[PDB]
A paper describes a structure:
The type VI secretion system (T6SS) is a bacterial nanomachine for the transport of effector molecules into prokaryotic and eukaryotic cells. It involves the assembly of a tubular structure composed of TssB and TssC that is similar to the tail sheath of bacteriophages. The AAA+ ATPase ClpV disassembles the contracted sheath, which resets the systems for reassembly of an extended sheath that is ready to fire again. The interaction of TagJ/HsiE with the sheath as well as with ClpV suggests an alternative mode of disassembly in which HsiE recruits the ATPase to the sheath.
In this study, we resolved the crystal structure of the N-terminal domain of Pseudomonas aeruginosa ClpV1 and observed structural alterations in the hydrophobic groove. The asymmetric unit contains two copies of ClpV1-N in nearly identical conformations (r.m.s. deviation for all Cα atoms of 0.5 Å). The overall structure of ClpV1-N is similar to that of the Vibrio ClpV-N, with matching secondary structure elements and an r.m.s. deviation of 1.6 Å for 121 equivalent Cα atoms. Both structures possess an N-terminal helix α0 that distinguishes ClpV-type ATPases from other Hsp100 ATPases (e.g. ClpA). The residues lining the VipB binding groove in ClpV-N are partially conserved in ClpV1-N. For example, Ile10 and Phe87 lie at the bottom of the groove. The corresponding residues in ClpV1-N are Phe10 and Leu88. The two aliphatic residues Leu6 and Ala86, which sit at the top of the groove in Vibrio ClpV-N, are replaced by large residues of opposite charge in ClpV1-N (i.e. Arg6 and Asp87). In one of the two ClpV1-N molecules in the asymmetric unit, these residues form a salt bridge across the groove, whereas in the other, they point into the groove. Both conformations not only diminish the hydrophobic character of the groove but also are incompatible with binding of an α-helix, as observed in V. cholerae. Consistent with the altered conformation of the binding groove, we were unable to obtain a complex of ClpV1-N bound to a peptide corresponding to the N terminus of HsiC1.
Author numbering: -1 to 160
The structure:
Amino acid sequence: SHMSEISRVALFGKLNSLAYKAIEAATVFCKLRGNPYVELVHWFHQILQLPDSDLHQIVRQSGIDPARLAKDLTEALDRLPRGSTSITDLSSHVEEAVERGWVYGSLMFGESQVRTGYLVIGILKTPSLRHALTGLSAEFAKLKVEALTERFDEYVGASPEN
């Protein structure tokens, strides 16, 4: 039944419009490339294609080299398996990141929607997701979750997710 496991419609339904539209864009990109799963690297690459976001600002305020990050994400994308003839699906890590972003957004910040900065915090607080993230770029080892949780507004500045 619909009540055996948490549904994607409920889980992803907690995303704000920027994050959810970027899941959609990531799916379209993933499919064009023939990659078998929509992954964190597709989602983060699509978020960084926008004019601005929490992720842009967190990169800036954390002292990450955004050009290096862009290089690393492009290279990770180019290395994914291609020519998938299977039906595309979402990576388990993308589902898990939304759950952890909901936990921190709703409990730590008292907020009804998950913005991309809460996705970053939820990832950093989960060892398997943090390992996946740094696997995409060693730049993400520069993130400091204690700073990001205590000084969130300073890190996200004038992000449109405000």
